[PDB]
Design a protein around this motif. Structure first.
Motif, short mmCIF file in Angstrom:
data_model
loop_
_atom_site.label_atom_id
_atom_site.label_comp_id
_atom_site.label_asym_id
_atom_site.label_seq_id
_atom_site.Cartn_x
_atom_site.Cartn_y
_atom_site.Cartn_z
N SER A 45 -13.18 -4.65 -11.10
CA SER A 45 -13.61 -6.00 -10.94
C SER A 45 -13.28 -7.04 -12.02
CB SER A 45 -14.99 -6.20 -10.38
OG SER A 45 -15.89 -5.68 -11.31
N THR A 46 -13.03 -6.65 -13.22
CA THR A 46 -12.74 -7.61 -14.21
C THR A 46 -11.33 -7.51 -14.47
OG1 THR A 46 -13.36 -6.01 -15.94
CG2 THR A 46 -15.04 -7.37 -14.86
N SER A 47 -10.62 -6.88 -13.57
CA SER A 47 -9.15 -6.89 -13.82
C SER A 47 -8.44 -8.26 -13.58
CB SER A 47 -8.40 -5.92 -12.90
OG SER A 47 -8.82 -6.16 -11.58
N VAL A 52 -9.44 -8.80 -2.09
CA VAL A 52 -10.18 -8.79 -3.35
C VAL A 52 -10.86 -7.43 -3.51
CG1 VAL A 52 -12.15 -9.74 -4.59
CG2 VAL A 52 -10.48 -11.29 -3.62
N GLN A 53 -11.47 -6.98 -2.43
CA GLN A 53 -12.10 -5.67 -2.51
C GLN A 53 -11.15 -4.53 -2.83
OE1 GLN A 53 -14.56 -3.08 -3.13
NE2 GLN A 53 -15.45 -4.89 -2.28
N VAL A 113 -7.47 -8.51 -9.99
CA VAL A 113 -8.36 -9.16 -9.14
C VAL A 113 -8.31 -10.68 -9.31
CG1 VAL A 113 -10.87 -9.57 -8.84
CG2 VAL A 113 -9.98 -7.32 -8.84
N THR A 167 -10.13 -4.67 -6.41
CA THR A 167 -11.34 -4.23 -7.16
C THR A 167 -11.37 -2.74 -7.16
OG1 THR A 167 -12.84 -6.04 -6.71
CG2 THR A 167 -13.78 -3.98 -7.42
N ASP A 168 -11.22 -2.16 -5.96
CA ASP A 168 -11.21 -0.73 -5.80
C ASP A 168 -10.19 -0.13 -6.71
OD1 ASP A 168 -12.87 -0.79 -3.64
OD2 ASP A 168 -11.34 -0.35 -2.07
#
Ligand SMILES: [Ca+2]
Ligand SMILES: [Ca+2]
Ligand SMILES: [Ca+2]
Ligand SMILES: [Ca+2]
Ligand SMILES: [Zn+2]
Length: 316
Positions: free
Chosen positions: A298-300, A289-290, A303, A293-294
Motif C-alpha cells: 500500500s505505500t508503494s 489499485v488493489q 500504487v 497493493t496486493d
C-alpha cells in the motif's frame, strides 16, 4: 490430424522469413503440437463459413503469396501463447491449454479481424486501408487476449465494460509486441494499416487524441455507435496504462512511470482476480489499485503511480 511433428519455413506478410511448427501426414499441415493442445490454422478460401480447411501444404515450404497470412497468424499465435505462459504462467486462453484456432482469407477485401467466441478470424484487407491483418503481432495478440478476457472477467462488449475489454486487448497486444521485440511501440496496427502512408496507425496509446479518441474522461463518447464507443473510449484507459508504464505529465497531473513488466503484472491481476462482466471505469481503477497493493504494498510507489495515472485521465 495425427502425424509427425516437424518444422517448415515460410515468409510472412511483411516479407520476413520465419520457421513454423507443422505436422506431417501425407501433406504438411499448419498444426503446432508443441504448444498446449495445439495451434491450428485454417484456410477460409475467401468465404465466410468457418473455420474452413485445416491448412495443408505439399512440401513444408510456405513462400507463395497466398501462404503469407497463414504463416503469420500461425507464428504469432505461438508467440502470444508463449508470452502468456512464460510471463503470466497461464496455459493458453482458458488456463487449461485449449487449442488455438485461426482462419485466414476470410471473405473478400475484409478490413478487419476478430475473436468470435471460439476462434480467431482474419480478413486480407482491401489492400489500401489494410493488408492482411495477421501481419501485425499487436493485432494477433489483441484478438487472442479477447479470449483470455472471455474466460476470466468476461467483460460485456458494450459501454464502459466494453471499452475496458478493448483497452485490455490493446495493452496486452502491445506488451506482446514488446516481448517479441518486433520494433515495438505504443501504437496499434501500424504494421498492417495504410500501406500507402508511413507513420500512422489505427489507434495510439501514447496519444489517443492524435486520431481523435478521447484522452480524458470528460471527453468520453456517450452515444450509440460502436457499441457505445468501445473502440473510442478505450483511449482513456489506454492513456492511463501508457502513463503507468512510461510516466509523464498529462493535463497538469504528473505520473512517475514503473515500467512495462509491472504494468502487465498489475493489469493481469486485475483482470483475472477482480474485474467482473459489468465493471466500469471507476471499478477498473479500484481493481488496479488493489492489484498493485496486493503485489507491492500500500505505500508503494507502484500504487502511487497507478492512482496518479487514473487521476490524470479523470477517472475517479
Ligand atoms: Ca508449399
Ligand atoms: Ca511496432
Ligand atoms: Ca504496435
Ligand atoms: Ca500506414
Ligand atoms: Zn478488440
Amino acid at each position: 490430424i495425427t502425424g509427425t511433428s516437424t518444422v517448415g519455413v515460410g515468409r510472412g506478410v511483411l516479407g520476413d522469413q520465419k520457421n513454423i511448427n507443422t505436422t506431417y501426414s501425407t501433406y504438411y499441415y499448419l498444426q503446432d503440437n508443441t504448444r498446449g493442445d495445439g495451434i491450428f490454422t485454417y484456410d477460409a478460401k475467401y468465404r465466410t463459413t468457418l473455420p474452413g480447411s485445416l491448412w495443408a501444404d505439399a512440401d513444408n515450404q510456405f513462400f507463395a503469396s497466398y501462404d503469407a497470412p497463414a504463416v503469420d497468424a500461425h507464428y504469432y499465435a505461438g508467440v502470444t501463447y508463449d508470452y502468456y505462459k512464460n510471463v503470466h504462467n497461464r496455459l493458453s486462453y482458458d488456463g487449461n491449454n485449449a487449442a488455438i484456432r485461426s482462419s485466414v482469407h476470410y471473405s473478400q477485401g475484409y478490413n478487419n479481424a476478430f475473436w468470435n467466441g471460439s476462434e480467431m478470424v482474419y480478413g486480407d484487407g482491401d489492400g489500401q486501408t489494410f493488408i492482411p491483418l495477421s501481419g501485425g503481432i499487436d493485432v494477433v495478440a489483441h484478438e487472442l487476449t479477447h479470449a483470455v478476457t472471455d474466460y476470466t472477467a468476461g467483460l460485456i462488449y458494450q459501454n464502459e465494460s466494453g471499452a475496458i475489454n478493448e483497452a485490455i486487448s490493446d495493452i496486452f497486444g502491445t506488451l506482446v509486441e514488446f516481448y517479441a521485440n518486433k520494433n515495438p511501440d505504443w501504437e496499434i496496427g501500424e504494421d498492417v494499416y495504410t500501406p500507402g502512408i508511413s507513420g500512422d496507425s489505427l489507434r495510439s496509446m501514447s496519444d489517443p487524441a492524435k486520431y481523435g479518441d478521447p484522452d480524458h474522461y470528460s471527453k468520453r463518447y456517450t452515444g450509440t455507435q460502436d457499441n457505445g464507443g468501445v473502440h473510442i473510449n478505450s483511449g482513456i484507459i489506454n492513456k492511463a496504462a501508457y502513463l503507468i508504464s512510461q510516466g509523464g505529465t498529462h493535463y497538469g497531473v504528473s505520473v512517475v512511470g514503473i515500467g512495462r513488466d509491472k504494468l502487465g503484472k498489475i493489469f493481469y491481476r486485475a483482470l483475472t482476480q477482480y474485474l467482473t462482466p459489468t465493471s466500469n471505469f471507476s471499478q477498473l481503477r479500484a481493481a488496479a489499485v488493489q492489484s498493485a497493493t496486493d503485489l507491492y504494498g500500500s505505500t508503494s510507489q507502484e500504487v502511487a503511480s497507478v492512482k496518479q495515472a487514473f487521476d490524470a485521465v479523470g477517472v475517479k
